[PDB]
Amino acid sequence: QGQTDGIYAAFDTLMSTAGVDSQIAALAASEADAGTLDAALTQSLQEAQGRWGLGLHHLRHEARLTDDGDIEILTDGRPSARVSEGFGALAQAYAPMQALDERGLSQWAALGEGYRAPGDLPLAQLKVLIEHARDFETDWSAGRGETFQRVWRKGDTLFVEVARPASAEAALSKAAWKVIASIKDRAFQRELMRRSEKDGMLGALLGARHAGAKANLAQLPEAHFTVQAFVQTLSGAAARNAEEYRAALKTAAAALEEYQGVTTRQLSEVLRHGL
Amino acid sequence: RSDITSLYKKAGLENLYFQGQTDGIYAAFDTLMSTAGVDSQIAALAASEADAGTLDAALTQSLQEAQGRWGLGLHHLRHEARLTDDGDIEILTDGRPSARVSEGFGALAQAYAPMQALDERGLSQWAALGEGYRAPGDLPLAQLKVLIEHARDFETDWSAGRGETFQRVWRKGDTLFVEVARPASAEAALSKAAWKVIASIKDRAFQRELMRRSEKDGMLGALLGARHAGAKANLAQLPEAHFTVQAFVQTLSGAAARNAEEYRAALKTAAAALEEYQGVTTRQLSEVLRHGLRES
Amino acid sequence: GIYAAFDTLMSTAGVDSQIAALAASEADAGTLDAALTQSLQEAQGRWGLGLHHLRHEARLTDDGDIEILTDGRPSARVSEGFGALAQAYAPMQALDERGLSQWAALGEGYRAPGDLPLAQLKVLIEHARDFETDWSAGRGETFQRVWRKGDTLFVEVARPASAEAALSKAAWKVIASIKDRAFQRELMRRSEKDGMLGALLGARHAGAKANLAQLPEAHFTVQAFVQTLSGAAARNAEEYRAALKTAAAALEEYQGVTTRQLSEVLRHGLRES
Amino acid sequence: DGIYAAFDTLMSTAGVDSQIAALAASEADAGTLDAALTQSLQEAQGRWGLGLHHLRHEARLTDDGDIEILTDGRPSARVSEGFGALAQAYAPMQALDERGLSQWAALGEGYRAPGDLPLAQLKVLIEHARDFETDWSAGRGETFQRVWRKGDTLFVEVARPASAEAALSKAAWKVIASIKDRAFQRELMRRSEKDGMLGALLGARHAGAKANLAQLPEAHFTVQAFVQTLSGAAARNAEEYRAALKTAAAALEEYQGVTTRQLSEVLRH
C-alpha cells in the first residue's frame, strides 16, 4: 500500500521550526521528477540542520522520497526516520548522535577528528588563521548577549556559527511567557497567567478547543525542534578576510535573535486571532 | 685510439668504485642511495636471504628518505621501488613506473626532470601539499607561531635562512616538516669534493702541482689528470655525477609539532645536518678521487 | 673619479678604453663621447648580454657623470653603480638555459638552423642577402652563430660564464699562489663559510659582503667574441670558417687575460691591506 | 567618352579581365575605382614583361575623366593620350638585354644571385634565406625564369620574350596557315619574304600600313611573362616553389596562346 501527501505539509511544518521555508507541498504539486524533490528535500534539510543546533555538521544529511510516497531522512546514507513516523521519532533518532557539554553545545568537530583551536583565541591570532591557514576549526567561546560562537573553514568556505542552546519544550514555553508578559491590559494579562496554572502557559493562549489544544500541545514539532544556532558562510576571497569574518559574526548573531523570536511572534498572532 | 684508452680508464675507475660493494642491481641501488646520505644496505638484506616483500619495503623506505635529500622538489608525489622478475628494480611515482635502475642513473635523472619545477635559485616551485594556499615565507615569527600551534595542514613559501640556506615548513596530519635547502648541482658537488682533496694534501710540492693544474682544467680534472669534461665523462656512469645532497627535512610530531620553539630548534638541526652532508662525499667516490695520487 | 669607473667597467670586457688618460689630455667633449661609445660597443660585443639589436652609446654630462644609452634613450648613469647598469640591462635580455641570448641580431624575421649542413650554409654566405643562423655548438665546448648585415658578416663565438664564477676563479688563483702555508690554509678554511672571494677579502660580515657585490666584475665578464668580415670576405665560406677559428682563439685569449688581470688586482689589494 | 573601355582594352593585352567599365557604370566611387585601376595595372605589369618590378605602379583618375598612369608617384602617361604614348613613357625606364630580358633587379640595389644556380643551392635560399633574388636562367621550352623574395612573399617569374611586332607576325602566321587555298597561302607565304607576315595580310604596303594603323594597344603590348606568388609557410617550401614554377610556365603558355587566338580573330575579321 502507498501512503498520502500530508507527508509534504508535515515536512514543511518541520522545516518551519528551523526557520526554513521549503515549500515542499507546493513543489509536490508541480509534479517534478523525484530527483527535483529529493534535491529540494535535501537542500532544505541541510539548512534546517544548520539552525537546529544538534551539532551534526560532520554527518552527511539527505532526504528522499520512498516507494510508498513517504519521506525518508538519512544521515551518512543510513536511514534515521520517516516523516510519517512523527516528529518525536526524528528528534529521538537524532539524539543518540549528539555529544553535548553541560551548556548544551556540541562537542563534535565540524571538520571531524583532528586539532581544534581554543575558543578564547585572541582576534590577533584568529586573524592569522583566517588569512594564512588552510582548513582550521575553533572550539566554542563565549559571545555577546549570552551567546556562544565558533568558526571553522573547509576548502573554499568559511563557516561562522553562533548558538544559544535551549530545549524545544523550554523555548516553546518561554515564547508563551513572552506573549503573556507583553500585554498592556493588566486584567487580561492576570487572567491568562491564572489560567496557565491548570492549562499551561501555551494552552492558556487558547489555540482552539480542549482536545484541539492537546492536538496543539504534545505532537507539535515546536515541542521537539527549535532554533538554537545560525551558521553564516563566506566564500572565495571573502573567506580569508578578517573584516569580512567580523561582519559575518555580527550578521549571524543578529539572524540568531531574529529566528529565535519566531515562536513568540507566532503565538502572539494566535492570541490576537483568539480574541 | 682515444676511445679505447678512454674505455680502459672508465672501466678501471668503475672497478675501483664497486670494489667491496656486494650484489649487482642491489649494489647499484645502494650507491644511488649513498649519494643522498642514506645507508640502505639492500645488498645485505638480499644476502641474508630476506624475502622479496621485505626488500620492496626497504627499497621504498630508502627511496623516500633519499627524496628528502636530493632536492628535486617531488614531495607531492608518492615514491616507490620494487623488484622485478628479470632482476631489475623498478622506480614508480604516484604508482606509475618512471624508471628502471638497470637503465643507469642519468636515465633516472632524466625520468625525474619532466616532473620538476625549479626556480632561478634551484628551489622547487611545487607546494609539498599540492594545490592550495601557501603563506608568505617571511612571516613574523609571532604569526608563524599561530599557524604552528593552531592550524591544520598549512604550508609556507621558501625564504632565506641563516647561513646561506633557504627554508620552508609545512604540516601534513600529525607531522610538521621543516625543510632546509642549499641547492648545488652534482657537478659543483664533485668540484667541492675534489677541492677538499686538493686542500688536504700535505706534500706542498704535489699540492701546488695539483692547484696549478686546477687553474686550466678543473678541480676534478686536476685530480684525474684530465681536462675538464673529460674528467666528467670518466665519472658519468657513477651516481655522484647525477645526484647529491641539496636539502634536509627534519620532522616533528606529536606535541613537539605544535611547539614554535621546537620548530626553531628543528631549523638549526636541519641546517647543521645539511652542512654536514654537503661537506662530505660518498666513501666510494672518495676512494676513487684519492687513488691516482702520487704523494700524500 | 667617474672616468676610472668607466675604464674599470671596460676592463671587464678586455677593452682598454683609456678614458682617464684621454680626459687628462684635455680632449674635447666630442672626442671623449666618441671614445666612450666606441669602447662601450666593443664591450657589448664581448659581455655576451645579447643586445646586438640595440644601439649602444655613452656620453659625458655636465655634472661629471657618464650616461649610457640604448636606442638613444637613457638606460643608466655610471654614478648609480654597476649593479644599476646590470639591472637596467636585465629587462632587455632573453637568455636561454645555456646562458645564450634568444634575441636575433637582425630583429624580427626568419632564422636558419644552427646545425645546418656546411655545404648549405655556404650557399647562404655566398648568395643570400641579410641572413641569420640560430645558436649551435662549436669547437672546444663553445657555441657559435653567424649573421649578415649589408656588407658585413658577423661571426659570434660564445662560452657563457657567470660573472660571480669568474670572480671566484680569480680569487682562487690568488689563494693558490700564496707562499705562506699557514696563511694559505687559513684562507682555504675560511673559504668554506665565506666564499672564495669573501675569504680573500676578509669579508666576514654584512656590508663587506654587500660591497663585494658592487664590483663590476660581479656583474659583467667576457662571455663571447664577435669577428667581422666585410667586402669579398663576407661572401667567402672558407673565410667564414677561418673566422670561427680566429673568434674562438680571441675569446679564449680575452677570458684568460681578464681573469689574470683580475687576479693581479685582487693580489695587489691583499698585499696593500 | 570610352576611357574606361580603353583601359579595359589595354588590360586585355596582359590577359587581365579588369572589368573597369563595369564598375564606372555601377557608380563605384573614386577610391575603389583607383584601387581597381591600380590593382589591374599591377597585375598587368606582371605579365607584360616590361621589367619595372622595382617601381611602384599607380593608376589614378582626373577631372576630365581619364586614367592617369604614374610610376613612383611621378606621372608617366594618360590613357586619353593613346597607348603608344604609354609605351614611349615606359621605354626610357627599361633596361632590356639582347634576349629581351630586363637587367633590373626586382629588389633594387643589393646583391643578386647568378642565374644558373643548381636547384640544390636555390633550395637553400628558398628554405632558409630572408630576402634574396636570382638573375635570369633558362627554363624548359625556350622559356626563361627567375625568383626573388621580398618580406613574406616569394615571386616566381617565367618569361618568353617577344616584341609586339613578333606577336603580330605570329598571329598573322597562324591566320595564314588557316587558309584552305594552298595557292593563296603559297602566294602570301612567299609575299612575306619581302613584306613580312603582317604585310602579307595588310595587302597594300607593309612598311606604311603597319605604322599608319597602330591604333590598338596590341601593337604596343603583349604577354611575355607570368609571375606567381607564394606567401607564409608556402613561401619557404621548396616543393611549393617547384609547383609554382611549373604553374607559372603553364599559365604563360595559356595566356600567350589565348592572346594569339584573339589576334587571329581580330586579323580575320
From Swiss-Prot, chain A:
Residues modified as Phosphothreonine: T66, T138
BP GO annotations: cellular response to desiccation; cellular response to gamma radiation; DNA repair; double-strand break repair via nonhomologous end joining
PTM comment text: Phosphorylated by RqkA in vitro. Phosphorylated primarily at Thr-66, and to a little extent at Ser-106 and Thr-138.
GO molecular function: damaged DNA binding; double-stranded DNA binding
Regulation: Phosphorylation increases DNA binding affinity.
Domain of life according to the entry: Bacteria
Stimuli inducing this protein: Induced to high levels following extreme ionizing radiation exposure. Also highly induced in response to desiccation stress.
The protein's role, per its UniProt record: dsDNA-binding protein that contributes to the ionizing radiation resistance of D.radiodurans. Plays a role in DNA repair and genome reconstitution, and is necessary for recovery from severe genomic fragmentation as a result of exposure to severe levels of ionizing radiation. In vitro, binds to double-stranded DNA carrying strand breaks and stimulates the DNA end-joining reaction catalyzed by DNA ligases. Thus, PprA plays a critical role in a non-homologous end-joining (NHEJ) pathway for the repair of radiation-induced DNA double-strands breaks.
Protein name: DNA repair protein PprA
Lineage, opening ranks: Bacteria, Thermotogati, Deinococcota, Deinococci, Deinococcales
Curated annotation (Swiss-Prot), chain C:
Consequence of gene loss (knockout): Cells lacking this gene show a reduced growth rate, do not exhibit a decrease in the efficiency of natural transformation, but are much more sensitive to ionizing radiation than the wild-type strain.
Domain of life: Bacteria
Keywords: DNA damage, DNA repair, DNA-binding, Phosphoprotein, Stress response
GO MF terms held by the record: damaged DNA binding; double-stranded DNA binding
Coiled coil: none
Modifications made to the protein after synthesis: Phosphorylated by RqkA in vitro. Phosphorylated primarily at Thr-61, and to a little extent at Ser-101 and Thr-133.
The encoding gene: pprA
Primary role: dsDNA-binding protein that contributes to the ionizing radiation resistance of D.radiodurans. Plays a role in DNA repair and genome reconstitution, and is necessary for recovery from severe genomic fragmentation as a result of exposure to severe levels of ionizing radiation. In vitro, binds to double-stranded DNA carrying strand breaks and stimulates the DNA end-joining reaction catalyzed by DNA ligases. Thus, PprA plays a critical role in a non-homologous end-joining (NHEJ) pathway for the repair of radiation-induced DNA double-strands breaks.
Uses, biotech or industry: The PprA protein combined with an immunofluorescence technique can be used to visualize radiation-induced DNA strand breaks in mammalian cultured cells, allowing the evaluation of DNA damage responses. This detection method could also be applicable to genotoxic tests in the environmental and pharmaceutical fields.
Name of the featured protein: DNA repair protein PprA
Phosphoserine sites (modified residues): S101
Induction section of the entry: Induced to high levels following extreme ionizing radiation exposure. Also highly induced in response to desiccation stress.
Phosphothreonine modifications at: T61, T133
Activity regulation, per record: Phosphorylation increases DNA binding affinity.
Record-level GO BP terms: cellular response to desiccation; cellular response to gamma radiation; DNA repair; double-strand break repair via nonhomologous end joining
Annotated effect of mutating S101A: Slight decrease in phosphorylation. Lack of phosphorylation
Organism, as annotated: Deinococcus radiodurans (strain ATCC 13939 / DSM 20539 / JCM 16871 / CCUG 27074 / LMG 4051 / NBRC 15346 / NCIMB 9279 / VKM B-1422 / R1)
